[PDB]
């Protein structure tokens, strides 16, 4: 379709992810297939990459995304900081797109928990935070323009394999141990070891707010064990919490669709229905870690009281496919299956793809999936959107 808008693309990672200079240059967006930002740019779709805290709360990552985009010191809010016990202020950024302050807009393409992070940034841009505005007045302290409301610079959000209603994987007995083993597998796919105390940061978790950092002489193995016991794994202000079915419910209750923004969901599935009791099993080609450690659980876990029945068993290795088309559990957002015309203010469900959680970003191979073709056709669609 004809190009109707000049808004640039921002790629936003999941509960794992890292900037373009990190991980010795192994891109999260393209992995072993190449560099997805490079593909869109060289095909005339100007594209940028955000890097926020992968284990942090969506709230933290919205404030991190904001500063990273417009430029400034990350401002988590005086109130939120007091309530949860971390720094009000994080890293300073120069700003990728200061023209957002002057009328420029962006399309966000987000993977995994990134789709929650993207939705929430919109909701804060539009409404801000009553509580922050209240707190800034009471204790005579500065307010981020983010908490004010009346901002708007996101023309479209696209979610790819996003736990909008959470993932049942979080309810696994040993999820803690199994989740940081996922972080290690991603490292290994990056050709980075978990048992070597690298001098340089390699993978920065951006836990400035919690005063956490991998230390001189500290391995990722030893660091992850330490993060397991830390507030970025034990508190409600975390990716862990937001990622649970109860986390997404509580997020859905306050993070709604802006009428000024297009939402596209892409769902993923990489499972087959078994004959014995209708459980779901990993297809051939699923990333080894998911196929062994995550999928068997995802595609047999039931809670009939929490609505978690057979619709929840199909999974992309990591997320229950049903959770992906858009928010439902605790949401009044509308979900319309794609009919050739993209609608503002609603979820354009662009369908389910035979592609696993890590294949869809190229962190695992799948020759059957044309990853260049997928991301180009998406950029072409987002460029076609009426502003
Ligand atoms: Ca594969
Ligand atoms: Zn926080």
Numbering used by the authors: 2 to 388
Study text:
5M mutant lipase was derived through cumulative mutagenesis of amino acid residues (D43E/T118N/E226D/E250L/N304E) of T1 lipase from Geobacillus zalihae. The active site of 5M is located at the center of the structure covered by two alpha-helices functioning as the lid.
The 5M crystal fitted the monoclinic system space group C2, signifying unit cell parameters of a = 117.59 Å, b = 81.27 Å, c = 99.52 Å. The 5M mutant lipase has a total of 21 α-helices and 11 β-sheets in its 3D crystal structures. The active sites of 5M mutant lipase composed of Ser113, His358, and Aps317. Both molecules in the asymmetric unit were highly similar, and the superimposition of alpha carbon atoms gave a root-mean-square deviation (RMSD) of 0.7789 Å. The zinc-binding sites in both chains composed of residues Asp61, Asp238, His87, and His81 in a tetrahedral formation. The calcium-binding site was coordinated by the residues Gly286, Glu360, Asp365, and Pro366. The mutant also experienced a decline in ion-pair interaction values, having only 20 pairs of ion interactions in chain A and 17 pairs of interactions in chain B. These results explained the loss in the thermostability of the 5M mutant, which also resulted in decreased melting temperature of this enzyme. The 5M lipase has a strong capability to catalyze long-chain carbon and shows preference towards pNP-C10.
